[PDB]
C-alpha cells in the first residue's frame, strides 16, 4: 500500500474532445557553428548517416536526416562545394572541437 | 469548544508583517505574573526621600549603604542646560537645520497642523481623565486594544486605502460596547421617498430599523440578540461555506452578550472585517495591544475612544457652492447630471412653489453628509 505518493488530477471529463492528430516530434534546434561543424563532418565522412549520428551525441539520426534533406533542397550549391573539398579523418582534434562546442553552448546557456 | 490554538508568546508568521493567532486575554495574566506592574496610580512625589531611597535600594539590589551614585542625579538634572541647535557637529543637527530651512523657505507659521491637532486633542482626552467614582476605577493590568477600520470609498480610487480613522477599546468591556461605539454614516441615512413630501420628518433611521451586526475572528461569528427585531446574518454565510468543499472548516457560532475580548484568539495586524446592516463592511486591523498605564483614561465606561478621526471633505452644494448639501436627486429635469447635490434653500426653490406643491417628475433622497460623525 502506497502512502501519499500520488496527487489527484482532473483529466478528460468525457466531453467533446479536440481532434489534435498532431505529434510534434521535439527536435533540438541548429546553431550557426553547429551547422558549420555538421557541414565539415559531411565533407569529411560523406553522406553516411550512421557515422554522423555516432559523432553527434547531442543530436539524433532522424534530425540529421531531416537537416541533410533540407540542405539538399535549399543550398545544393553549398552541398556540392562541401562535397568537392576533402579533408582527412581527424579524431583527437575532432574531440577537442567537440569540447569547444560544449563550452560554447554552455556559455550560451549561461547568457 | 475552548480557545483555539495559540501561545501567549507571539511568533511572527511572516517577518515583520503579521503574527500567529494567540489568546490576547492570557497576556493580561502572563505579563502581570512575569512583571509586578505595580505603580499605575501616578503617585510620584511632588532628607526623608533619600532615606526611603536608601532603605529600598540598599535592600533590593544595591549592597553598599553609601549614597555615591547620587552624582548621576546631579549629572541629569543639575547638569541640564531656550538654546539654539548649533555649534556642534551632529547629523541630527544637520537634519534639524534642513527642516528649519525648508520651513523658512515656504512655511509661515506652525498653525498648519489641524490634521495633527485632531490626534493631539484625542490623545489629550485620554490623559487627566479622572473616574466618576471609586467603584468605577479601572483595575490594574487592564488590557487595551487598538483597531483601525476602513469603511468609506470617497477617498483615492487609484491608490491604496490609507486615509481613514483609528479607534481604541478596553479588554474588560463587552463586545456590545465596541459594537455600539462604531459610528458609520450608513446608520444615519433615511429610507423612503421625500419628493412627494419634503417636510416629512424622519420617522426611523436605518440604525433602529436594522440592528443586525456580527464579527469575524478566526471562524467565530458573534451574533447579537439584545433586541427582538435584529436578525442572524450568519445563517447564510455558514451554508455557502458548507454547500461545497471549498476548504473552509466548520465555523463556530456564539452570542455577543456573554463573550469578552479576552477569549478573542486573533492575530495582530491581520486584516479581519466587521459587518453590520446587511453588507455594511469595515476592514479591521488590530495593530497594538498593551496593558494599562498610569497615563491612560481612568474611566472604564467612557473609554471607546476614537483616538484618530481622519478628516473628511464635506460635499458642497452644486448650485451655490457655499453650503453643504442634504438631498440627492435622481431623474432630474434641470440638473446638468443625475447625481447632483442640493441644499435646503436650493431644493426648496428647485421643484417646489410657495405652497410646496410638487413640480415636475423627479426623485429625491435624504443625503446625510459623512461630516456629521467627522
Amino acid at each position: 500500500c502506497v502512502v501519499e505518493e500520488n496527487d489527484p488530477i482532473f483529466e478528460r471529463g468525457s466531453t467533446t474532445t479536440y481532434s489534435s492528430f498532431r505529434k510534434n516530434y521535439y527536435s533540438k534546434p541548429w546553431s550557426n557553428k553547429e551547422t558549420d561543424m555538421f557541414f565539415l563532418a559531411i565533407s569529411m565522412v560523406g553522406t553516411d548517416f550512421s557515422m554522423i549520428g555516432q559523432l553527434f551525441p547531442h543530436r539524433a539520426r532522424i534530425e540529421i536526416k531531416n537537416k541533410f534533406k533540407r540542405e539538399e533542397k535549399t543550398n545544393g550549391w553549398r552541398i556540392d562545394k562541401a562535397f568537392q573539398e576533402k579533408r582527412p579523418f581527424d579524431f583527437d582534434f575532432f574531440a577537442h572541437l567537440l569540447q569547444k562546442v560544449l563550452a560554447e553552448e554552455e556559455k550560451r546557456k549561461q547568457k | 469548544v475552548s480557545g483555539s490554538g495559540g501561545c501567549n508568546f507571539p511568533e511572527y508568521e511572516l517577518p515583520e508583517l503579521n503574527t500567529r493567532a494567540f489568546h490576547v486575554g492570557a497576556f493580561g495574566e502572563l505579563w502581570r505574573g512575569r512583571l509586578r506592574g505595580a505603580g499605575d496610580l501616578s503617585l510620584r512625589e511632588p532628607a526623608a526621600d533619600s532615606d526611603r531611597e536608601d532603605a529600598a535600594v540598599a535592600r533590593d539590589l544595591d549592597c553598599s549603604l553609601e549614597a555615591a551614585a547620587e552624582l548621576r542625579a546631579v549629572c541629569g538634572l543639575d547638569k541640564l542646560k531656550e538654546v539654539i541647535p548649533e555649534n556642534t557637529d551632529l547629523v541630527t543637527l544637520g537634519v534639524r537645520k534642513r527642516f528649519l530651512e525648508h520651513r523658512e523657505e515656504t512655511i509661515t507659521i506652525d498653525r498648519a497642523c489641524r490634521q495633527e491637532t485632531f490626534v493631539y486633542e484625542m490623545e489629550s482626552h485620554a490623559i487627566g481623565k479622572k473616574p466618576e467614582n471609586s467603584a468605577d476605577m479601572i483595575e490594574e493590568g487592564e488590557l487595551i486594544l487598538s483597531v483601525n477600520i476602513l469603511y468609506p470609498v470617497i477617498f483615492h480610487k487609484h491608490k491604496e486605502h490609507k486615509p481613514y480613522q483609528t479607534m481604541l477599546v478596553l479588554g474588560s468591556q463587552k463586545l456590545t460596547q465596541l459594537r455600539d461605539s462604531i459610528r458609520c454614516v450608513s446608520d444615519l441615512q433615511i429610507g423612503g421617498e421625500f419628493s412627494n413630501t419634503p417636510d416629512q420628518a424622519p420617522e426611523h433611521i436605518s440604525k433602529d430599523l436594522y440592528k443586525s451586526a456580527f464579527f469575524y475572528f478566526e471562524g467565530t461569528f458573534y451574533n447579537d440578540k439584545r433586541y427582538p427585531e435584529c436578525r442572524d446574518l450568519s445563517r447564510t454565510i455558514i451554508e455557502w461555506s458548507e454547500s461545497h468543499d471549498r476548504g473552509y472548516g466548520k465555523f463556530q457560532t456564539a452570542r455577543m452578550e456573554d463573550f469578552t475580548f479576552n477569549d478573542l484568539c486573533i492575530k495582530l495586524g491581520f486584516p479581519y472585517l466587521y459587518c453590520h446592516q446587511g453588507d455594511c463592511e469595515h476592514v479591521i486591523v488590530i495593530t497594538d495591544i498593551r496593558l494599562v498605564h498610569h497615563d491612560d483614561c481612568l474611566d472604564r465606561t467612557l473609554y471607546p475612544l476614537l483616538i484618530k478621526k481622519h478628516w473628511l471633505w464635506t460635499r458642497k452644494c452644486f448650485v451655490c457652492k457655499m453650503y453643504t448639501a442634504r438631498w440627492v436627486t435622481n431623474n432630474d429635469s434641470f440638473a446638468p447630471e443625475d447625481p447632483c447635490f442640493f441644499c435646503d434653500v436650493c431644493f426648496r426653490m428647485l421643484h417646489y412653489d410657495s405652497e410646496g406643491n410638487k413640480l415636475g417628475e423627479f426623485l429625491a433622497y435624504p443625503y446625510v453628509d459623512p461630516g456629521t460623525f467627522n
Partner: protein
C-alpha cells in the same frame, strides 16, 4: 483586498441587503461622480453620430435587401427593371446619407436617442445611461454657447427673476436669450449676487458661535466650515474674523 474578507471569485449577499437597497437608503455607493475627459467626449460624439447614422440607414438597408431578394425571386423583365431602378434610387439615398456632413445629423438636445445602447456598448458600462444623457443634453452639445458673459446680461437676468419670483429659472433663461443652460448662467448670477453675503454682526449669533466652538473645536484650529454649514449666510472667507 478592500471590500470584504469573503470577497472571493463570487461574493455572497445577505437578506438585509434587499431591505437596505429597496427603501432608498443609498449612502455612499452613489456619490462616486467623476469629471470628463477629451477621449470621453470624442467617444460620446462618435457613439451619438453612429447611433443616428444607424437609425437612418437601417430602413434603407432593409429595403435594399428586400429589393435584392425580390429581384432574385421575380422573373419578369419589366419588374426586374423596376426593381433595379428602385434599388438605384435606394443606393443614391444611402450615398447621400453617407456623404452628409456631421452637423445636421446631430439632432437637438432632447432628440430621441437610445442612451442605454450607448452606455452598455460604446462606454462599456463605464458611464450610466442618465450620466451620458444629461451630459449630451446640456454639457456637450454644439447648441451651447461656450463664450463667457460680457457683464451685460446679469441686470436683465435679475430683473426677470424679480418680476417672476425666482420660481423657474428655465423660462427666465429662455426669455433672456443667451443660448445657454439655466445652470450655466445661475452660477454666475449667484456669483454676482450680493444677497449671499452677510451684514453687521449681532449678539445672538455670538452665543451660537461660542456653543459650536465649545462643542467641536480642537486645539488652536477652529472648523469654520462647520460654522458655514450651521450658520446660513456666512461664507468661508470673512467668517474666520469671528475668531481673529
Amino acid at each position: 483586498y478592500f471590500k470584504d474578507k469573503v470577497t472571493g471569485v463570487g461574493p455572497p449577499a445577505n437578506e438585509d441587503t434587499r431591505e437596505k437597497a429597496a427603501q432608498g437608503i443609498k449612502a455612499f455607493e452613489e456619490l462616486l461622480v467623476t469629471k470628463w475627459k477629451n477621449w470621453e467626449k470624442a467617444l460620446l460624439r462618435k457613439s451619438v453620430v453612429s447611433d443616428r447614422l444607424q437609425r437612418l440607414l437601417q430602413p434603407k438597408l432593409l429595403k435594399l435587401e428586400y429589393l435584392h431578394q425580390k429581384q432574385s425571386k421575380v422573373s419578369s423583365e419589366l419588374e426586374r427593371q423596376a426593381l433595379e431602378k428602385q434599388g438605384r434610387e435606394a443606393e443614391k439615398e444611402i450615398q447621400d446619407i453617407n456623404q452628409l456632413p456631421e452637423e445636421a445629423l446631430l439632432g437637438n438636445r432632447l432628440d430621441s436617442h437610445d442612451w442605454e445602447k450607448i452606455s452598455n456598448i460604446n462606454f462599456e458600462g463605464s458611464r450610466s445611461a442618465e450620466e451620458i444623457r444629461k451630459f449630451w443634453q446640456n454639457s456637450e452639445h454644439p447648441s451651447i454657447n461656450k463664450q463667457e458673459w460680457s457683464r451685460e446680461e446679469e441686470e436683465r437676468l435679475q430683473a426677470i427673476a424679480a418680476a417672476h419670483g425666482h420660481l423657474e429659472w428655465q423660462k427666465i433663461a429662455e426669455e433672456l436669450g443667451t443660448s445657454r443652460s439655466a445652470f450655466q448662467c445661475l452660477q454666475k448670477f449667484q456669483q454676482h449676487n450680493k444677497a449671499l453675503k452677510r451684514k453687521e454682526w449681532t449678539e445672538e449669533e455670538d452665543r451660537m458661535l461660542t456653543q459650536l466652538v465649545q462643542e467641536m473645536r480642537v486645539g488652536s484650529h477652529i472648523p469654520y466650515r462647520r460654522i458655514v454649514y450651521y450658520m446660513e449666510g456666512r461664507d468661508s472667507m470673512q467668517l474666520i474674523y469671528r475668531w481673529t
